[PDB]
Design a binder for this molecule. Structure first.
Ligand code: A1AD4
Ligand code: CA
Ligand code: MG
Length: 304
């Protein structure tokens, strides 16, 4: 990666501006709903400008431009922006078909940008690098990170996987790639300490984390990945005559937290945020109470 000096950061700004203009095409009919690329990219520009304002002399800019996380961040922001641009150039009119694979790929990129914004705000809070001081929520997960990586803010996927393998083995390439897509929110082949904190919060406890991840995010019909509150209500409408139908999902606005949606006996659709217990225990309890019976409306309800 190149040094993340001012010129390189400004080059990234110009690419992000082109993505914004591409996404303002009136034929796109883009809905103001998270992740909303037309808010995320300006917000990213604003936070990057804040960072530069905190590193406002030659020696400070030197430190910033050679910070390993920041160099990787800017390189990855530039690559995803070029990808977005290329998507429009190759998609042509297919970009305006709402359910085309091209538009689906735009939605994927909008999610990636949303995650990248959350990451940079977590690592440079108020524009100052704090990655070496980042506090991992789960103490046992924190001990793994510190043992193998110390105060590092970011690690290549290959290195991360090799260390994780020492604690939880992974033999399947399919499993490894699925795990990478869960952990590596920014899809840049690096695991940040922020991405590690989100993963270990969601799939706690740490001692069984691969089992928990498999049970919830791999082999569970109820798992819907990232959805908005409105999208949960809309998807569960078709199950409104099957009380006990339920799904669980992630919020791109509040990373690291699960939400559940279910159909009541009356046919109403309710949503709830489980607290102070791992999701799989909240599903166990909700099933034994008769609320969570049919994940995605299906008749097979996994048991843990
Ligand atoms: C993984 O997801 C999480 C995780 C944590 C939170 C979440 C969400 C929802 C999201 O991110 O999707 O959300 C908020 C939170 C803190 C503040 C906050 O905003 C200022 C919210 C947003 C909120 O409460 N919503 C309520 C809403 C949403 C849900 N539900 O998604 O499960 C349940 C609700 O109550 C049971 C609820 O409140 C409406 C009501 O009670 O009638 N309704 C309608 C809305 O339209 C929004 C979405 C916390 C608590 C930190
Ligand atoms: Ca990443
Ligand atoms: Mg803003």
């Amino acid at each position: 990666q190149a040094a993340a000096d001012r010129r390189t950061v400004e080059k990234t700004w110009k690419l992000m501006d082109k993505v914004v203009r591409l996404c303002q095409n009136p034929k796109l009919q883009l809905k103001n709903s998270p992740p909303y690329i037309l808010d995320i990219l300006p917000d990213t520009y604003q936070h990057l400008r804040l960072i530069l304002s905190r590193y406002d002399d030659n020696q400070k800019l030197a430190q910033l431009s050679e910070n390993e996380y920041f160099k990787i961040y800017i390189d990855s922001l530039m690559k995803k922006s070029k990808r977005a641009i290329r998507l429009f150039k190759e998609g042509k009119e297919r970009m305006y078909e709402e359910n085309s694979q091209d538009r689906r790929n735009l939605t994927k990129l909008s999610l990636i940008f949303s995650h990248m914004l959350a990451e940079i705000k977590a690592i440079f809070p108020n524009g100052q690098f704090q990655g070496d001081n980042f506090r991992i929520t789960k103490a046992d997960a924190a001990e793994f990170w510190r043992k193998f990586f110390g105060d590092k803010t970011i690690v290549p996927w290959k290195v991360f996987r090799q260390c994780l393998h020492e604690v939880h083995q992974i033999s399947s390439g399919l499993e490894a790639m699925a795990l990478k897509s869960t952990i590596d929110l920014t899809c840049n082949d690096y695991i940040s300490v922020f991405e590690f904190d989100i993963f270990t919060r969601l799939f706690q406890p740490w001692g069984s984390i691969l089992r928990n991840w498999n049970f919830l995010a791999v082999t569970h019909p109820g798992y819907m990945a990232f959805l908005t509150y409105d999208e949960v209500k809309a998807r569960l409408q078709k199950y409104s005559t099957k009380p006990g139908s339920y799904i669980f999902r992630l919020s791109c606005t509040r990373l690291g937290q699960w939400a559940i949606g279910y159909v009541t006996g009356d046919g109403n659709i309710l949503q709830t945020i489980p607290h102070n217990k791992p999701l799989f225990q909240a599903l166990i309890d909700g099933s034994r109470e008769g609320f969570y019976l049919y994940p995605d409306g299906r008749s097979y309800n996994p048991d843990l």
